[PDB]
Amino acid sequence: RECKTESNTFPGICIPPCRKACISEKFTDGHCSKILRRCLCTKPC
């Protein structure tokens, strides 16, 4: 299962700094969502 949830520490709007925030939060990657422009973290779970 891949878990995907918004970064808790990423500041502001998401348009690399997301990936960095997510790894800091112990996820394995991060990306920006297309519509809401949020930093979303992903990891195996």
Place this chain on the structure above:
Amino acid sequence: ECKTESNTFPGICITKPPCRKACISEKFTDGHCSKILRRCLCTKPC
């Protein structure tokens, strides 16, 4: 959507409503039990 395990739901996910409740408290919009491990999974637009 975002989809991840509920952090506050206690124990095994037997039926959906208590999982949905926990997920909504965690500011998701819905929850459901996983087929086999029967974990409570939360979902929301993201």
